Design a protein around this ligand. Structure first.
Ligand code: NAG
Ligand code: NAG
Ligand code: DAO
Ligand code: XXH
Lengths: 269, 269
């Protein structure tokens, strides 16, 4: 069980994460209203929310996403898109670690996530910094679904502690690195990570523990079914690095559960 | 705005209509349980419901669907799939009428749906007749989404009057013929047709009335949004051939609205 305000926040950033796929966007001028097809992001459309900067297939990892300004909620939101086809992305997912002492000593992260981020970090940091300067009062939020969720988690860990808090809301994110990287994520000040999972979603169960991955704590776990609407009672806060009894349970996982966080996500009607 | 009992039927056959796309049965032998992927048909799975005959790309229209036995609800269900890529099917959709006197006098129907039905009619009639014999007190229901709705409607008009009632539940069905056919489907005895539409779904708006097409009355119009759950209070019975102020409004239409009838339909998570 979670509060009404936190629920609202979860719902909202699920929608900012969905909008990265379903935005009628990119090649889209900054200052343009954010809108989505197929009722993917109505809470974003109600807000006075506009693109600050769009990126598409940027750097080494072909990164895609947007930076947004939201005058109603007082946010600067960096939203990273997951893969265009999650099924093949999961299939070709490689489990190699690389060191990232730059982020925390002793830390190793998934190699493709950290290198995709690393390769666009300098541009996007500057874009965020610019927006922070313009709106010092506004709250900085990074978010994403799936691989997008990963990238937002990495960028957060990397960019925190430079003066402004960075909250992270992740939906169906994979593990992003080794224990230690997990531990850092569980305690790092300068922002909070809300790591949201749904039922038996496959993606947060990869990379597997066996390959040297852990999940940060806590975990926000939606227990309502696929295509079922979520209420506050359906969300369970689960404490403990690599805790079991939320998404991390011993049963057959599901791709469709990956695509239903509050609403349709990771696909566009 | 509709009865609970009617809302429950509408929901059940939306799910049988969704199963024609989802829940693997590709060669599933007769008598196996009906199930779907992606929580597309839970009310069906909850019933004691089994396949009688599966068909696929059958006849000239590459018609696909199944016939089921439902012992819990006491039904014999013939469910037609719509198109495997609806956006395309929408783009390739010819508006030509053809005479269909055999069904009714002065009646013209859409050439492709009519022909497609006619090519499978004998084999499917025989399979329904068999089940009707083994279960004389079960209700015969034909149902379908999109193209599947057109077909079910045509098949119903074509096989009624043989001694067993056939009810038809269509979802997001296009127009199937001319005003004289609309009339025949409005008043025909030996069953009821329940023609359900959602919001500004585009498909029930095609073929255009400006190509000689008309809609049978009544229409059951779902006013709740895309990705929004439906209650009995969100459905409005609209009376009159080519009535306006349900789905048939001059506003701009939408494809995602076509894929949300009670739940997700015409696509599988
Ligand atoms: C963008 O949204 C703003 C505030 O929410 C609204 O006043 C404006 O009409 C919208 N702009 C366009 C171009 O639709
Ligand atoms: C088929 O469903 C029936 C009841 O609806 C159930 O008794 C039976 O076990 C199911 N068969 C399988 C293989 O699950
Ligand atoms: C009654 C079942 C009819 C379903 C089969 C139609 C074939 C769908 C293939 C996709 C081509 C198209 O876009 O129309
Ligand atoms: O509607 C609510 C609401 C609550 C909190 C937040 N937020 O902190 O961004 C946004 C929306």
């Amino acid at each position: 069980e979670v509060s009404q305000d936190l629920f609202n926040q979860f719902n909202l950033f699920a929608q900012y994460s969905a909008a990265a796929y379903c935005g009628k966007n990119n090649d889209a001028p900054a200052g343009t209203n954010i809108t989505c097809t197929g009722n993917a992001c109505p809470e974003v459309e109600k807000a006075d929310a506009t693109f600050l900067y769009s990126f598409e297939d940027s750097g080494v990892g072909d990164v895609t996403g947007f930076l947004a300004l939201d005058n109603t909620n007082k946010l600067i939101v960096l939203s990273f898109r997951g893969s265009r086809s999650i099924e093949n992305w999961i299939g070709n997912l490689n489990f190699d670690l690389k060191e990232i002492n730059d982020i925390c000593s002793g830390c190793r992260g998934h190699d493709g996530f950290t290198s995709s981020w690393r390769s666009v970090a300098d541009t996007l940091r500057q874009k965020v910094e610019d927006a922070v300067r313009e709106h010092p009062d506004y709250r900085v939020v990074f978010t994403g679904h799936s691989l997008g969720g990963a990238l937002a988690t990495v960028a957060g860990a990397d960019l925190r502690g430079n003066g402004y808090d960075i909250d992270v809301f992740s939906y169906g994110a994979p593990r992003v690195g080794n224990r230690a990287f997990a531990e850092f994520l569980t305690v790092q000040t300068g922002g909070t990570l809300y790591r949201i999972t749904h039922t038996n979603d496959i993606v947060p169960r990869l990379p597997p523990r066996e390959f040297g991955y852990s999940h940060s704590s806590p975990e926000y776990w939606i227990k309502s079914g696929t295509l079922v609407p979520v209420t506050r009672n359906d969300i369970v806060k689960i404490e403990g690095i690599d805790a079991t009894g939320g998404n991390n349970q011993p049963n057959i996982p599901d791709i469709p559960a990956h695509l239903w966080y509050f609403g349709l996500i990771g696909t566009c009607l």
